[PDB]
Amino acid sequence: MKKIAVLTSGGDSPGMNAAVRAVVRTAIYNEIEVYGVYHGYQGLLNDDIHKLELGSVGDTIQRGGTFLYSARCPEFKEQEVRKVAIENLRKRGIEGLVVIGGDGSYRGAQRISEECKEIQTIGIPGTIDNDINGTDFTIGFDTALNTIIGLVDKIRDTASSHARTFIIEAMGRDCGDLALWAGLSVGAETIVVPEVKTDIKEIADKIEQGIKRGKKHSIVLVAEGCMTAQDCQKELSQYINVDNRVSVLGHVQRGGSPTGADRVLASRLGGYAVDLLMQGETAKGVGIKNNKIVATSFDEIFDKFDYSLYELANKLSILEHH
Amino acid sequence: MKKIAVLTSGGDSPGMNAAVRAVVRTAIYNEIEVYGVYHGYQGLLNDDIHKLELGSVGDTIQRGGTFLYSARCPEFKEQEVRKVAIENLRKRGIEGLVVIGGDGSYRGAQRISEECKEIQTIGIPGTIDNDINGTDFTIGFDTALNTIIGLVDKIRDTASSHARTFIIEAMGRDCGDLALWAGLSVGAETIVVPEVKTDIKEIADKIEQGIKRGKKHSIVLVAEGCMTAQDCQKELSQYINVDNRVSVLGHVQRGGSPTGADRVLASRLGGYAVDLLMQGETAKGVGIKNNKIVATSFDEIFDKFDYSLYELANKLSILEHH
Ligand SMILES: O=P(O)(O)OC[C@H]1O[C@](O)(CO)[C@@H](O)[C@@H]1O
Ligand SMILES: O=P(O)(O)OC[C@H]1O[C@](O)(CO)[C@@H](O)[C@@H]1O
Numbered sequence: 001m002k003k004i005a006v007l008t009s010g011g012d013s014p015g016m017n018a019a020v021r022a023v024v025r026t027a028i029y030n031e032i033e034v035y036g037v038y039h040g041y042q043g044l045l046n047d048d049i050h051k052l053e054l055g056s057v058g059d060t061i062q063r064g065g066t067f068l069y070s071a072r073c074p075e076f077k078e079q080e081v082r083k084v085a086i087e088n089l090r091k092r093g094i095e096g097l098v099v100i101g102g103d104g105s106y107r108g109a110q111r112i113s114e115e116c117k118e119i120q121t122i123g124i125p126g127t128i129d130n131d132i133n134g135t136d137f138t139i140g141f142d143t144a145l146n147t148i149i150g151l152v153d154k155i156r157d158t159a160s161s162h163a164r165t166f167i168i169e170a171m172g173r174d175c176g177d178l179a180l181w182a183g184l185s186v187g188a189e190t191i192v193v194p195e196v197k198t199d200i201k202e203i204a205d206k207i208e209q210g211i212k213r214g215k216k217h218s219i220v221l222v223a224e225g226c227m228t229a230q231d232c233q234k235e236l237s238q239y240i241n242v243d244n245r246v247s248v249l250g251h252v253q254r255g256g257s258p259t260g261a262d263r264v265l266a267s268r269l270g271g272y273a274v275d276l277l278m279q280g281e282t283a284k285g286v287g288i289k290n291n292k293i294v295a296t297s298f299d300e301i302f303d304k305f306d307y308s309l310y311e312l313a314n315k316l317s318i319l320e321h322h
Numbered sequence: 323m324k325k326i327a328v329l330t331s332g333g334d335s336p337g338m339n340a341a342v343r344a345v346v347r348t349a350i351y352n353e354i355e356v357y358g359v360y361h362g363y364q365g366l367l368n369d370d371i372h373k374l375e376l377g378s379v380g381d382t383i384q385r386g387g388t389f390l391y392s393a394r395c396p397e398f399k400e401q402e403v404r405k406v407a408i409e410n411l412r413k414r415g416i417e418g419l420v421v422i423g424g425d426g427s428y429r430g431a432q433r434i435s436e437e438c439k440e441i442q443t444i445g446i447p448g449t450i451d452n453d454i455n456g457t458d459f460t461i462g463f464d465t466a467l468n469t470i471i472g473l474v475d476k477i478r479d480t481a482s483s484h485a486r487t488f489i490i491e492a493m494g495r496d497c498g499d500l501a502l503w504a505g506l507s508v509g510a511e512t513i514v515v516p517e518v519k520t521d522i523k524e525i526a527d528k529i530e531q532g533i534k535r536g537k538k539h540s541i542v543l544v545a546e547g548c549m550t551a552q553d554c555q556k557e558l559s560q561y562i563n564v565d566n567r568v569s570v571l572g573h574v575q576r577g578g579s580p581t582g583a584d585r586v587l588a589s590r591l592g593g594y595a596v597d598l599l600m601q602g603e604t605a606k607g608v609g610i611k612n613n614k615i616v617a618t619s620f621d622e623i624f625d626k627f628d629y630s631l632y633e634l635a636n637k638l639s640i641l642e643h644h
Contacts, residue, residue, distance in 0.1 A: 025638045054640060061509050062475050136613055145582040146468075153384050153579070185585040187383050257475070260467040261583060263507040264631075271634050290612040291458055309586075312593050316347045318376060 001120075001278050003094045005049065007037035008066040009073075009108070010101035012254060013128045013140025015262035016066040019100050021057040022270025023124075028054055030278060035094060040101070041073035041108055044085035049092070061263055064143075064255045070101070076108050079115070086116045096277035098270070100124045100139075102132055103302070106285055110298040113283040120282035122273040123298065124266075128254055131175035133304075134296035135287025139269065141178070142261035144171065144253045148182040151249055156186065156219065163216040165207075165244040167236075169229035170221060171253045176305060178253070179223035184313040189218035191313060192232060194225035195305040200232070204239035206319045211242070213322040268293055323442075323600050325416045327371065329359035330388040331395075331430070332423035334576060335450045335462025337584035338388040341422050343379040344592025345446075350376055352600060357416060362423070363395035363430055366407035371414070383585055386465075386577045392423070398430050401437070408438045418599035420592070422446045422461075424454055425624070428607055432620040435605040442604035444595040445620065446588075450576055453497035455626075456618035457609025461591065463500070464583035466493065466575045470504040473571055478508065478541065485538040487529075487566040489558075491551035492543060493575045498627060500575070501545035506635040511540035513635060514554060516547035517627040522554070526561035528641045533564070535644040590615055 006023045008016050020036075027034040034052045037043040060067060075081045089097065097119055099109040109121035125132040128144035148170055159166050172178040176193030183191035189210070190203050207218060222229050229246045236242075258266070269286045272293050276284060284295040314320045328345045330338050342358075349356040356374045359365040382389060397403045411419065419441055421431040431443035447454040450466035470492055481488050494500040498515030505513035511532070512525050529540060544551050551568045558564075580588070591608045594615050598606060606617040636642045 022634075022638060025640075025643075029637050029643060054643060058640075061507070062478075142583065149582050149585075156384075181582055181586055184589055185383070185582045259581070260471050260503055260507045261464065263471075264503055267506055267634065267638065268631070271637065290614070292612070309590070312344075312589065315351050315593065316344060316589065318347075318380075321347075321351060321376060 001032060001095055003033045003035065003092065004096035004098060004274070004277060005035040005037050005089060005094050006098045006100070007040055007043060008068045008070050008100045008126065009040035009105035010070060011127060012066045012070055013126045014064045014143035014256050014258035015139040015266040016100055016126045017060040017063050018258060018263045018266035019124050019126060019139055019270040020066070020068060021060050022267040023098050023274055024052050024057045025054065026271040026274040030274065035092065036068050039069045039071040041076050041085065042071040044088055045073065045081065047088045049088060062257050064257055082111055082115060086112060086119065089119060090116065094119065096120045098122050098124060098273045100126045102127045106298055106301065110283055120277050120280070122276050122281070123285040124269045124273055125285060125287055128171060128178070129173045129175050130177040131173055132285070133301040134285040136289055137265065139262055139266045142259045143256060144178055145181050146259055147253050147256055148178060148249060149185045151252065152182065152186040152219065152221070155247060159217050159219065163243070165217045165220070165242050167220045167222060167229045167233050167244060167246050169248045170223055171249065172223050172225055174225040176223040176225060179221050180306070180310055180313065183221040184309065184316070186219065186221070187316070188221040189317045189319040190220040192220065192222040192226045194223060196310065198226060200235045201239055204236055207242065208240050210319045210322045215318055215322055218319060323354060323417055325355045325357065325414065326418035326420060326596070326599060327357040327359050327411060327416050328420045328422070329362055329365060330390045330392050330422045330448065331362035331427035332392060333449060334388045334392055335448045336386045336465035336578050336580035337461040337588040338422055338448045339382040339385050340580060340585045340588035341446050341448060341461055341592040342388070342390060343382050344589040345420050345596055346374050346379045347376065348593040348596040352596065357414065358390050361391045361393040363398050363407065364393040366410055367395065367403065369410045371410060384579050386579055404433055404437060408434060408441065411441060412438065416441065418442045420444050420446060420595045422448045424449045428620055428623065432605055442599050442602070444598050444603070445607040446591045446595055447607060447609055450493060450500070451495045451497050452499040453495055454607070455623040456607040458611055459587065461584055461588045464581045465578060466500055467503050468581055469575050469578055470500060470571060471507045473574065474504065474508040474541065474543070477569060481539050481541065485565070487539045487542070487564050489542045489544060489551045489555050489566060489568050491570045492545055493571065494545050494547055496547040498545040498547060501543050502628070502632055502635065505543040506631065506638070508541065508543070509638070510543040511639045511641040512542040514542065514544040514548045516545060518632065520548060522557045523561055526558055529564065530562050532641045532644045537640055537644055540641060
């Protein structure tokens with residue numbers, strides 16, 4: 001294991017730079033040469049592959065985004081395209097590849113380990129959405145959670161001034177974790193998530209009852225994987241007329257300096273990926289499960305919602321009580 | 323279990339209000355009357371005990387500090403003093419007491435459960451220092467971690483401009499967790515913690531070697547439980563002369579709006595404390611252990627440092643490499 005490469009694929013998340021930094025610094029500590037692959041899997045195809053030195057990752061732990069960049073590569077599904085990637089790695093004597101990203105990213109890394117005997121691959125879970133198996137939390141979730149909390153805490157100021165209900169759309173793709181964690185954190189009176197049956201009438205009834213009880217406005221926090229905020233607004237309006245606004249938080253949730261949890265998790269996972277490569281392992285995604293750093297085969301990963309936490313959030317809502 | 327009381331004791335931490343809110347809202351959800359005790363155990367003695375309603379905890383989840391206040395009560399060590407406290411609870415028909423704070427707080431709650439058959443007690447771990455058993459993380463740690471990261475990220479700007487080394491003192495009482503997590507997070511080149519043998523000469527040697535290698539300045543992050551920053555500075559100066567400054571971060575680390583991790587953990591623990599009281603349990607501190615919500619007897623609590631994480635942080639330091 002003398003030479004490794006690292007790339008970031010899929011949507012960027014805060015903490016991906018800390019993960020790259022830990023792969024780089026851990027590899028160099030162990031006298032392994034490290035190559036950066038730029039623009040994700042597109043980099044493998046275009047041969048945008050460059051040796052990194054210790055200084056290449058200075059001034060990065062605190063930075064959001066990915067300094068390696070990410071670009072989509074749907075053509076990686078063709079075995080002939082993959083052969084070109086493999087040869088661009090093998091031309092340089094690369095023996096291990098670390099991929100930081102989501103499921104897609106892991107599928108490419110699974111193909112590479114299957115199609116090149118001489119390359120081991122390891123995946124590190126990077127996404128704001130918390131939707132990757134093999135880990136309880138993904139790199140970027142904590143940061144995005146705190147981004148949403150900050151934004152909604154601001155919205156709450158204006159909601160309170162005007163007794164204005166807000167219907168706020170959070171990211172998460174098909175996962176409700178961001179909406180659940182953030183909604184509990186901001187005291188959202190209603191949280192709409194794809195993992196729970198949607199009953200707009202019920203939500204309207206709760207809101208109307210609140211008003212009867214002198215709760216004049218509320219926050220509805222809506223996971224995009226369920227519906228759009230604008231759809232929620234339209235559906236509610238069938239049942240009740242309240243003074244409301246829609247907010248779509250958008251790509252702000254993807255950015256920013258990573259929190260401590262993300263910088264530490266990213267660092268732990270990046271160093272462990274390098275350790276796994278040295279130990280001769282392949283085709284595994286790393287993670288933290290029950291507060292332990294673990295590795296899971298891509299098979300088992302491919303082949304989480306905390307209903308108890310959702311129950312709690314509802315108990316804490318004054319609308320559940322009214 | 324018809325009537326419960328709640329108090330905050332020991333140093334305040336961000337998230338204590340979210341914990342009080344969850345105890346209040348969970349109790350009222352279960353048709354239990356809740357009483358706030360103000361100024362910690364002093365409140366029990368002065369009978370500063372007032373019924374809370376649902377609205378008493380509005381506008382609190384996001385707020386730092388404790389709205390119940392905290393005040394020291396070393397006289398609680400006298401059994402005659404404790405009898406007055408118990409009677410102020412029993413006069414009102416209180417059957418359960420939730421204490422949010424540290425070890426001290428838990429010692430009082432242990433005495434109360436021993437000395438009053440009719441009162442069950444449960445402790446919730448609230449401290450920035452992460453130094454309470456029965457939990458992997460305390461309420462406030464995540465917030466304080468992110469406070470330190472923000473402060474040191476700023477210091478790093480000025481350090482970089484001037485090639486100035488900073489020796490920064492973090493809180494934590496006798497626990498190095500804050501310094502470790504924050505130090506890894508900011509790329510501190512040296513972290514000084516009470517759990518590891520202190521070798522100032524060694525640290526000086528690493529710094530001097532860095533300079534030889536063109537690393538002109540660094541950050542030393544020092545847990546107060548080891549030594550003061552000013553002591554570290556003085557001891558280093560025996561061995562090397564560098565252009566340096568000392569920063570003591572201080573009580574800023576205690577304040578601020580809690581992060582999502584703290585608001586969610588506080589909420590989970592507050593609701594679980596109420597559940598334990600309903601279930602007939604006593605003399606237990608709650609926590610999260612291996613990502614599961616648990617309860618531990620005060621005995622077992624009274625009767626954690628991640629050396630692997632420390633090892634990683636050192637591997638990531640360019641000074642460890644130079
Ligand atoms: O960056 P894009 O292509 O707009 O995709 C948006 C999606 O990406 C994510 O931000 C990250 O996977 C999702 O939360 C969101 O559904
Ligand atoms: O608030 P005080 O009495 O100055 O005590 C400071 C101590 O309290 C804590 O802030 C919280 O326990 C410690 O980190 C610190 O050593």
